[PDB]
């Protein structure tokens, strides 16, 4: 199937409570495999999936050097952005970065990503060309000019097309039994009367991986988007995910409703009904 790798950096200032915290986590698809936290008693890159544990000491030290250096640079960046927005020394602020590479079903690079935010709003993004930037405002334009002057895009491109893809393919092979395994949802429909003339039908999907899934209700074959309650896909804690979709229907019309489920683990979409 298709696969991606992403790293997620969060740098958070906290005036009066020490230097800004830097935490990095790494993912292949929906599986976290590393972490680094500057607030740890002894900050170091730590494994978070069994298949990364085989990497040697040089790997762990290489990661740790990268994250320790980033910790320091992000503190400078937080100071710089405070200034670009004319902000006080009093408030706590956050820079986030997410970046990585997407591969298609053949293992070839589909595209790269490298996006940053400040206080939860887009700040600067590497364009799909991996060569130019989109800045969200005149503050981010300062960063853009600085990064253009230092030919930063060229560095990001070299990584995204090179080491990013190479290491993702390695992880996919080393973790093939899980990373390249799609677990289909286990499904059922429940029925709960809400009154004498209405009942809730809830369509459940449990135990699936990866998290991407489509769960919908149809009435007489028509999508019921507005009248469907859909919860956010949620982690079970055993690698798998859960989701449900509910609709409130007239008592006696239950058989006019069908739940449709699509998931990578499914050869063909499922259609389910309440089974009294």
């Amino acid at each position: 199937g298709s696969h991606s790798m992403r790293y997620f950096y969060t740098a958070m200032s906290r005036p009066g409570r020490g230097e800004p915290r830097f935490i990095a986590v790494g993912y292949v698809d929906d599986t976290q495999f590393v972490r680094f936290d500057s607030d740890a008693a002894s900050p170091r890159t730590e494994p978070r999936a069994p298949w990364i544990e085989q990497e040697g000491p040089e790997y762990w030290d290489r990661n740790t050097q990268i994250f320790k250096t980033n910790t320091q640079t992000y503190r400078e960046s937080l100071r710089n952005l405070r200034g670009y927005y004319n902000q006080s020394e009093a408030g706590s602020h956050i820079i986030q970065r997410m970046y990585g590479c997407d591969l298609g079903p053949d293992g070839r690079l589909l595209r790269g990503h490298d996006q940053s935010a400040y206080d939860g709003k887009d700040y600067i993004a590497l364009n799909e060309d991996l060569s130019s930037w989109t800045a969200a405002d005149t503050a981010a334009q300062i960063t853009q000019r600085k990064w253009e002057a230092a030919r930063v895009a060229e560095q990001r491109r070299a990584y995204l097309e090179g080491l990013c893809v190479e290491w993702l393919r390695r992880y996919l092979e080393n973790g093939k039994e899980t990373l390249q395994r799609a677990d289909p949802p286990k499904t059922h429909v429940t029925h709960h009367p809400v009154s004498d003339h209405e009942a809730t039908l809830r369509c459940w999907a449990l135990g699936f991986y990866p998290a991407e899934i489509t769960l919908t209700w149809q009435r007489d074959g028509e999508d019921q988007t507005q009248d469907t309650e859909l919860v956010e896909t949620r982690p079970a804690g055993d690698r798998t995910f859960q989701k449900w979709a509910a609709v409130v229907v007239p008592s006696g019309e239950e058989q006019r409703y069908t739940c449709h489920v699509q998931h990578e683990g499914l050869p063909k979409p499922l259609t389910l009904r309440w089974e009294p």
Binding site: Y7, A24, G26, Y59, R62, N63, Q65, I66, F67, T69, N70, T73, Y74, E76, S77, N80, L81, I95, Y99, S116, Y123, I124, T143, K146, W147, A150, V152, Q155, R156, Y159, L163, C164, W167
Partner: peptide, 13 residues
Amino acid sequence: LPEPLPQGALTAY
């Protein structure tokens, strides 16, 4: 593997 450090100094925002 995360983005490696550049040959020159890592550029801040």
